[PDB]
Design an enzyme around this catalytic site. Structure first.
Site, PDB file in Angstrom:
ATOM      1  N   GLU A 184      25.589   6.240 -14.194  1.00 40.72           N
ATOM      2  CA  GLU A 184      26.668   7.152 -13.684  1.00 40.72           C
ATOM      3  C   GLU A 184      26.211   7.611 -12.045  1.00 40.72           C
ATOM      4  OE1 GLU A 184      26.760  10.145 -16.394  1.00 40.72           O
ATOM      5  OE2 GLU A 184      28.035   8.990 -17.922  1.00 40.72           O
ATOM      6  N   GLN A 194       0.817  -1.373  -0.046  1.00 40.10           N
ATOM      7  CA  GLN A 194       0.019  -0.015  -0.068  1.00 40.10           C
ATOM      8  C   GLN A 194       0.731   1.241   0.053  1.00 40.10           C
ATOM      9  OE1 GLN A 194      -4.056   0.996   2.322  1.00 40.10           O
ATOM     10  NE2 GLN A 194      -2.262   1.442   3.586  1.00 40.10           N
ATOM     11  N   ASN A 215       3.363  12.401  -0.339  1.00 42.13           N
ATOM     12  CA  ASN A 215       3.721  11.621  -1.498  1.00 42.13           C
ATOM     13  C   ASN A 215       4.074  12.253  -2.637  1.00 42.13           C
ATOM     14  OD1 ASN A 215       2.702   9.274  -0.038  1.00 42.13           O
ATOM     15  ND2 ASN A 215       0.691   9.795  -0.564  1.00 42.13           N
TER      16      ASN A 215
HETATM   17  N1  LIG Z   1       5.314   7.802   3.271  1.00 43.91           N
HETATM   18  C1  LIG Z   1       4.313   7.357   3.225  1.00 43.91           C
HETATM   19  N2  LIG Z   1       4.261   5.997   3.980  1.00 43.91           N
HETATM   20  C2  LIG Z   1       3.152   5.112   4.109  1.00 43.91           C
HETATM   21  C3  LIG Z   1       1.994   5.371   3.316  1.00 43.91           C
HETATM   22  N3  LIG Z   1       1.022   4.487   3.721  1.00 43.91           N
HETATM   23  C4  LIG Z   1       1.639   3.470   4.436  1.00 43.91           C
HETATM   24  N4  LIG Z   1       2.935   3.933   4.846  1.00 43.91           N
HETATM   25  C5  LIG Z   1       3.856   3.279   5.580  1.00 43.91           C
HETATM   26  O1  LIG Z   1       3.864   1.969   5.621  1.00 43.91           O
HETATM   27  C6  LIG Z   1       3.814   1.267   7.027  1.00 43.91           C
HETATM   28  C7  LIG Z   1       2.721   0.205   7.140  1.00 43.91           C
HETATM   29  O2  LIG Z   1       2.695  -0.677   6.045  1.00 43.91           O
HETATM   30  P1  LIG Z   1       1.413  -0.480   5.090  1.00 43.91           P
HETATM   31  O3  LIG Z   1       1.673   0.714   3.832  1.00 43.91           O
HETATM   32  O4  LIG Z   1       0.431   0.285   5.699  1.00 43.91           O
HETATM   33  O5  LIG Z   1       0.892  -1.884   4.551  1.00 43.91           O
HETATM   34  P2  LIG Z   1       1.827  -2.759   3.526  1.00 43.91           P
HETATM   35  O6  LIG Z   1       3.155  -2.065   3.178  1.00 43.91           O
HETATM   36  O7  LIG Z   1       0.775  -2.570   2.230  1.00 43.91           O
HETATM   37  O8  LIG Z   1       2.227  -4.216   4.262  1.00 43.91           O
HETATM   38  P3  LIG Z   1       0.875  -5.197   4.528  1.00 43.91           P
HETATM   39  O9  LIG Z   1       0.535  -4.692   6.083  1.00 43.91           O
HETATM   40  O10 LIG Z   1       0.896  -6.322   4.214  1.00 43.91           O
HETATM   41  O11 LIG Z   1      -0.514  -4.458   3.755  1.00 43.91           O
HETATM   42  C8  LIG Z   1       3.683   2.532   7.776  1.00 43.91           C
HETATM   43  O12 LIG Z   1       4.528   2.569   8.860  1.00 43.91           O
HETATM   44  C9  LIG Z   1       4.147   3.684   6.978  1.00 43.91           C
HETATM   45  O13 LIG Z   1       5.113   4.313   7.132  1.00 43.91           O
HETATM   46  C10 LIG Z   1       1.916   6.712   2.556  1.00 43.91           C
HETATM   47  O14 LIG Z   1       1.001   6.923   2.104  1.00 43.91           O
HETATM   48  N5  LIG Z   1       2.953   7.497   2.733  1.00 43.91           N
HETATM   49 MG   LIG Z   2      -1.307  -2.647   3.040  1.00 46.98          MG
END
Ligand SMILES: Nc1nc2c(ncn2[C@@H]2O[C@H](COP(=O)(O)OP(=O)(O)OP(=O)(O)O)[C@@H](O)[C@H]2O)c(=O)[nH]1
Ligand SMILES: [Mg+2]
Ligand SMILES: Nc1nc2c(ncn2[C@@H]2O[C@H](COP(=O)(O)OP(=O)(O)O)[C@@H](O)[C@H]2O)c(=O)[nH]1
Ligand SMILES: Nc1nc2c(ncn2[C@@H]2O[C@H](COP(=O)(O)OP(=O)(O)O)[C@@H](O)[C@H]2O)c(=O)[nH]1
Lengths: 51, 430, 432, 48, 430
Positions: C247, C11, C221
């Site tokens: 490079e 995500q 983002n």
């Molecule tokens: N910069 C940024 N970080 C995000 C965003 N969404 C989630 N994160 C980061 O993702 C971490 C948690 O993982 P998630 O992205 O919520 O879920 P996932 O990476 O799909 O992994 P799963 O738990 O298996 O679904 C959080 O600690 C956030 O730091 C976002 O929109 N922007």
């Molecule tokens: Mg997720």
């Protein structure tokens, strides 16, 4: 509740210029017209709110 | 921005606080429904000092009402401007105090103070940067001086650096209203001096005199007396809510008025005050404002300021006036009357100017003065207490609730300690 | 002729990818439906369909359908390839073993087939850009699996990972220190360059410069997308000093194990306070070295610098850069390592940055983006190491991992690798 | 020998002004640091 | 995809389920006749989670109603929203258990459960991709307490990898309606802790306290209590049925909330809750939502958080709001109440943001907390159990239907072991 009561100090810093540059009265008339200026200053409060 | 939270307790405190929010709301243009209806923009820059914004666009004050009996609060909610207060801020008991200091501080207050202290904390953490507290209460009653002093003591523990304001309506012998006034009054002074930072005493005797003789109205009522207190209280913190030449919040007043930590009992006064039939014949100028400012009969206390020496005084000027004329008047008084001012402190008068006068007035001044003449009020209260305490009259109710006469002896000695220490600076010479 | 493929997993990776593709369409003028109303700079990110629309060169991978279905029902439905949006049925649910041993095995076959169907179309492939948030299940689980498979299937192609590591003191999940280290072992020997993009630094940037007291993820983002565009800007735009993807590792990596770097960007201002400053090249380059402006929550003053690859896009003049860089070297608070006399790799581009309509950023003639390698990055590996040891000392949350097919002892190798990496940073930093 | 509040007070009335989102998300309402440019220049590059 | 099936047993469970289905139907825009008349696309976006599509275009819930008495069954059939359920899913006995755990788990349950297990298998094999099971029952009533836990055992035996949820109303000491209640409460707990993946506990006294103090309702009823429970229940699957910035599902909650296999007993709560009088005085913000969330008086349980330390907690936010504000509030509260939080796991709070608030509110919050204070309920229940069991009172009903005292001894020992091992980590330090 008066609108003029809310005017405050530090707004006295530069604010335009009442007398324009193209209608400057001469020195002769300013000396001559002090009679009404003194007259206006003395009785301005007496005819507005004293009545 | 540097908000202050207001707490009113007891019967007298609620009545004082009832009219305070009437004056403030009219100054800020808030109707009984809490919707802003002002005309000038200056009424909204610092409105968050006293009011909280709610969803939907209405302003609710951060006021807390506390009592042991629901009689007075049921009256204040049904009156005008009674819908502003948040309904969750009303806290009450079901037994009452009955002018019993022990009941309001040891038995009944001790079990209800937990609930009211919770809402006190909730409002405080809501504010961005808290400035301090202001309390309105009376020292001649049980619930007033009982939980009033208890609450200050508790508040001081979790907020040791925030300021504290109290407006104490202390009893006077000429206007007697209770037979157990000396007992609970001298007990509160014992605890009040240790915690509060600013205390401003008020006597009903002075208010009755100023109404009958200065305002010259035939039939005064408690509404009129409460009105004079409201104007003086709002003038103290007016400069915190409006622009002016010299800004001076409540912290600045404490620094300049308190030479030693135990001397923080002041007496206040408000000017100008004129009768309804003689306001045309007077002139609203600085020289006439200051002459009524220093009048002995204009103070809100029975103490005569000409029986002692001023330690330090503070003058808050409201409206537009030249700063040179303000200081010239202050310096002139201090020179012509060198006998009434303490000499080892040079220039013991403070001046503050704010640009916004009260609604319906052109100029106004709020006077606060730390004078040694205030010892007289403590002297007379001490005499009544010791005369009645010697025979142990009316005592078994105070001692019937877990309290002992040892505390009574300690309290009178400490108030005796304050009087002797307060006077000895009057005789001090350089 | 020059192309890169973008891989989005998790995500966190997807929700920043769609923001990036919003920015890329605006730069080349491609309408959201894919058509262009009215030279071939777009070829690095898009491929012509033969008649009309241009399709992006990216594949979306996820195990949960919530984010993907949002894209398919959004206004960007007609842009992406319908079968390039791979989605599963069961979430990984913050469990690394689920994404690496249980569910991720059945999906990696589908993604590799599509990537194969995308590389043959390209002729001058440059490398890969993979986006994933480390502190997650599918982000760390699948991300480790794709890196392992790509490294043997393609080999010498440079892979760039834009990872978002957990913040130092604030976090969303509670067990993410566990699966952050597990994925750390995988990416160390399988990605060429990794970039630190935690959220705490980006929160501070919005609060101070843009004065956004309550920002949402979309603001974060958009700022990330601008950095990616600048890095690729030399590939698709003519410039005075062009820089290619190949490079980077020749000029940013001193030793093969030391390839973790943190970024910075400047200027970042609103459109009303931009009237009151001139945004000269001398001051935008000074704001780049402000420690508070680092995209990673790390204080560079606690360590040396190894190298700096900083790029200007706009109308900068080459003489201005040398004047600005000379001042930096004369400054004492910024000190480099003793065995690297020159440490600046500078490129100049003629393409000023664009701004999305309704966006927070303002349009200016100059912008600088930095990729810097420094010894100060050793702190972040230590702080996650401290957090992991606190929980693992009593085997908390372990029964969820051992029951999904992963050995209990795997935590020993993952922990011992980070300690080995720390030993390298402290060894290289000492003088000679 | 009970007004309309019978568990329906969890969500009641809530006129249009209440429901709209907060007051600002991802934008500054401060006068000096806002994003909108004046009418004179709807688009101009902000430098020298 | 990732849908869940619902099964309910006992009178209390049936009432909870009926009100939950009413709430879900209202939120998804499904009329009582089963026809879709929603106003937004997101209403129909993910309707497959809770409903089935039949011929003619109407929706039926995938709910299975089980009982031993047809009275409440006929009442819920004739009540509102009683036409949604498929008539086949009604399975009931003809005798009843008479508040006897032995009778509901060995005599009639064993012979009746074949048909309900058949229909459960039918639904589970019919759904595309099962996510888990959720069950509503009570631990005081014999038929629910026995048949529900036997069915949990069978379902866990047949579907090992899925998730099981139970929304159970545990006995309260002050509000008691059964005299043999501790016996079957302990017997239910012994079997539940072994198989159930998650357990959520509710208290009638806690609901009464909430509705009387926070809501200030004069005449609360089971309708209101069921409405509160139903809102708190739908808050969990809000994020699964609607999009959001940080989506989270049941498995995510389980992994992030359960450190050790047998420590899976949680307490829930809902916010915001305000009375009608104070409805317009409140401002809906993340700080005040978190304050009410962490307020102990908002918990659906009589256990006091100040009597223990939190292991982990979760907060599902509904509505459009900034993520930085939520993260900062979580960090601030965790630092402010550090003494109340276990110290060997850093950042023991999980926050999730969903973009669809409940119908009628701009924002809402659901809280699930795993704290060491929950041992008090088991302590009280075990105290009552041993007090009655030392005299073998009411034991002949249980001993005359196949059981013996060794099972009671084993259940008591297991409950005591759970209490001791659950208290160990409260004082365990790093
Ligand atoms: N910069 C940024 N970080 C995000 C965003 N969404 C989630 N994160 C980061 O993702 C971490 C948690 O993982 P998630 O992205 O919520 O879920 P996932 O990476 O799909 O992994 P799963 O738990 O298996 O679904 C959080 O600690 C956030 O730091 C976002 O929109 N922007
Ligand atoms: Mg997720
Ligand atoms: N100014 C003012 N004083 C009041 C009012 N009501 C009572 N008092 C004073 O309060 C004193 C009695 O206080 P009491 O009612 O016992 O205080 P309580 O114990 O807190 O309720 C009397 O001497 C009155 O002068 C009022 O409305 N205004
Ligand atoms: N919240 C709630 N609790 C209920 C309701 N009906 C019964 N109860 C509780 O259930 C307990 C009795 O359980 P019982 O009905 O005998 O369970 P059963 O034998 O399985 O039907 C009582 O202590 C009640 O507090 C209801 O409608 N709502």
């Amino acid at each position: 509740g008066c609108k003029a009561m809310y005017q405050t100090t530090n707004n006295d810093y530069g604010q335009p210029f009442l007398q324009d540059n193209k209608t400057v009265p001469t020195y002769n008339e300013l000396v001559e017209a002090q009679t009404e200026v003194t007259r206006a200053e003395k009785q301005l409060k007496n005819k507005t709110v004293a009545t | 921005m540097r908000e202050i939270v207001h707490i009113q307790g007891g019967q007298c405190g609620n009545q004082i606080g009832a009219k305070f929010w009437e004056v403030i709301s009219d100054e800020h243009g808030i109707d009984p429904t809490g919707t802003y209806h002002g005309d000038s923009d200056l009424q909204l820059e610092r409105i968050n000092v006293y009011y909280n914004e709610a969803t939907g666009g209405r302003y609710v004050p951060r006021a807390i009402l506390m009592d042991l009996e629901p009689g007075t609060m049921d009256s204040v909610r049904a009156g005008p401007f009674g819908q502003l207060f948040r309904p969750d801020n009303f806290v009450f008991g079901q037994t009452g105090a009955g002018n019993n200091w022990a009941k309001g501080h040891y038995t009944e207050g001790a079990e209800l103070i937990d609930s009211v202290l919770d809402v006190v904390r909730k409002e405080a953490e809501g504010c961005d940067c808290l400035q301090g507290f202001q309390i309105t209460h009376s020292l001649g009653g049980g619930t007033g001086s009982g939980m009033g002093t208890l609450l200050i003591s508790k508040v001081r523990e979790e907020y040791p650096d925030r300021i504290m304001e109290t407006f104490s309506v202390v009893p006077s012998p000429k206007v007697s209203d209770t037979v157990v006034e000396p007992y609970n009054a001298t007990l509160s002074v014992h605890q009040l001096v240790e915690n509060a930072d600013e205390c401003m005493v008020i006597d009903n005797e002075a208010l009755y005199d100023i109404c009958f003789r200065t305002l010259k109205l035939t039939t005064p009522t408690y509404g009129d007396l409460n009105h004079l207190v409201s104007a003086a209280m709002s003038g103290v913190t007016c400069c915190l809510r409006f622009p002016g030449q010299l800004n001076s919040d409540l912290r600045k007043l404490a620094v300049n008025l308190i030479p030693f930590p135990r001397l923080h009992f002041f007496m206040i006064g408000f000017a100008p005050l004129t009768s309804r039939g003689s306001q045309q014949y007077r002139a609203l100028t600085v020289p006439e404002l200051t002459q009524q400012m220093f009048d002995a009969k204009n103070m809100m206390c029975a103490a005569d300021p000409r029986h002692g020496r001023y330690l330090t005084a503070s003058a808050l000027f409201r409206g537009r006036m030249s700063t040179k004329e303000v200081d010239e008047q202050m310096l002139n008084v201090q020179n012509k009357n060198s006998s009434y001012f303490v000499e080892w402190i040079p220039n013991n008068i403070k001046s503050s100017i704010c640009d916004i006068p009260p609604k319906g007035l052109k100029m106004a001044v709020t006077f606060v003065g730390n004078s040694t003449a205030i010892q007289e009020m403590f002297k007379r209260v001490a005499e009544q207490f010791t005369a009645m305490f010697r025979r142990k009259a009316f005592l078994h109710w105070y001692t019937g609730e877990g309290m002992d006469e040892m505390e009574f002896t300690e309290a009178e000695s400490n108030m005796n300690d304050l009087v002797s220490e307060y006077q000895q600076y009057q005789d001090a010479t350089a | 002729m020059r192309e890169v493929i973008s891989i989005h997993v998790g995500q966190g990776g997807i929700q920043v990818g769609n923001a990036c593709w919003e920015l890329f369409c605006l730069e080349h003028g491609i309408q959201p439906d894919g058509q262009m109303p009215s030279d071939d700079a777009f070829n690095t990110f898009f491929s012509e369909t033969g008649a009309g629309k241009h399709v992006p060169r990216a594949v979306f991978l996820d195990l949960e359908p919530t984010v993907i279905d949002e894209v398919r029902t959004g206004t960007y439905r007609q842009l992406f390839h319908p079968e390039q949006l791979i989605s599963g049925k069961e979430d990984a649910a913050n469990n690394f073993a689920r994404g690496h041993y249980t569910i991720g095995k059945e999906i990696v076959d589908l993604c590799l087939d599509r990537i194969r169907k995308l590389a043959d179309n390209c002729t001058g492939l440059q490398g890969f850009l993979v986006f994933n948030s480390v502190g997650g299940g599918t982000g760390s689980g699948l991300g480790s699996l794709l890196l392992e498979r790509l490294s043997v299937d393609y080999g010498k192609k440079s892979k760039l990972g834009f990872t978002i590591y957990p913040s130092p003191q604030v976090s969303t999940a509670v067990v993410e220190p566990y699966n952050s280290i597990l994925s750390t072992h995988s990416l160390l020997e399988h990605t060429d360059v990794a970039v630190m993009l935690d959220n705490e630094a980006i929160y501070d940037i919005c609060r101070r410069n843009l004065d956004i007291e309550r920002p949402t993820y979309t603001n974060l983002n958009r700022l990330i997308a601008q950095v990616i565009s600048s890095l690729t800007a030399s590939l698709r735009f003519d410039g005075a000093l062009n820089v290619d993807i190949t490079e980077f590792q020749t000029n940013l990596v001193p030793y093969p194990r030391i390839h973790f770097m943190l970024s910075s960007y400047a200027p970042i201002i609103s459109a009303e306070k931009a009237y009151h400053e001139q945004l000269s090249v001398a001051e935008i380059t000074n704001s780049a070295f402000e420690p508070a402006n680092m995209m990673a929550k790390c204080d560079p003053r606690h360590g040396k610098y190894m190298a700096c690859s900083m790029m200007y896009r706009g109308d900068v003049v080459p003489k201005d850069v040398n004047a600005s860089i000379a001042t930096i070297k004369t400054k004492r608070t910024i000190q480099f390592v003793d065995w690297c006399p020159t440490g600046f790799k500078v490129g100049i581009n003629y393409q000023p940055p664009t701004v999305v309509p309704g966006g927070d950023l303002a349009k200016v003639m100059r912008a600088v983006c930095m990729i810097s390698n420094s010894t100060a990055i050793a702190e972040v590996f230590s702080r996650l190491d401290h957090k992991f040891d606190l929980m693992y000392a009593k085997r908390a949350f372990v029964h969820w991992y051992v029951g999904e097919g992963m050995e209990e002892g795997e935590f020993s190798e993952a922990r011992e690798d980070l300690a080995a990496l720390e030993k390298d940073y402290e060894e290289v930093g000492i003088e000679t | 020998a009970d007004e309309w509040n019978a568990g329906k007070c969890i969500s009641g009335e809530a006129t249009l002004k209440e429901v709209q989102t907060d007051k600002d998300l991802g934008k500054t309402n401060r006068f000096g640091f806002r994003n909108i440019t004046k009418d004179g220049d709807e688009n101009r590059v902000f430098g020298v």
